[PDB]
Write a protein of this length. Sequence first.
Length: 188
Amino acid sequence: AQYEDGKQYTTLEKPVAGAPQVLEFFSFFCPHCYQFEEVLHISDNVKKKLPEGVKMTKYHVNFMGGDLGKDLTQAWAVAMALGVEDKVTVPLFEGVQKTQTIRSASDIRDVFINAGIKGEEYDAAWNSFVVKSLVAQQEKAAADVQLRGVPAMFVNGKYQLNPQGMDTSNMDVFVQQYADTVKYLSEK
């Protein structure tokens, strides 16, 4: 067919029941994740083509960047809880990979402060049990698919995107092939 199992996507041998409909994993340490998010805008273009009623989830992972990597997973939980993902995604990516000015939990906190989150609110969220359960959700979802690399996208806990079998000569064309493929999988 046009969309072949083992080509543009693979099927999980062990389907994950109860999984989010569209689930993306990334790391702020991940160079291809920086490309995906800051240059290609994969999440946004997938969103614009998803059928009505299909929600998008994006989680951070621990297996890159050691201690700071784990701090970033907790910070991403704070971002999700406060609903400020769209305010901190760019300065966190640029802080880790472009300026290399994020070296501690306090440097992470500075990004939220600069983005207009009050110090008191950030600190409250950072130590909250709501954030601890969000951290748990991120770890569990990665564990459910035995995740060992990013970026990664899963659809209905059944299908995993396979971008390596795609022409990347043109960035726009690649992004829309990726998005059209997620849409196809979402309708499967």
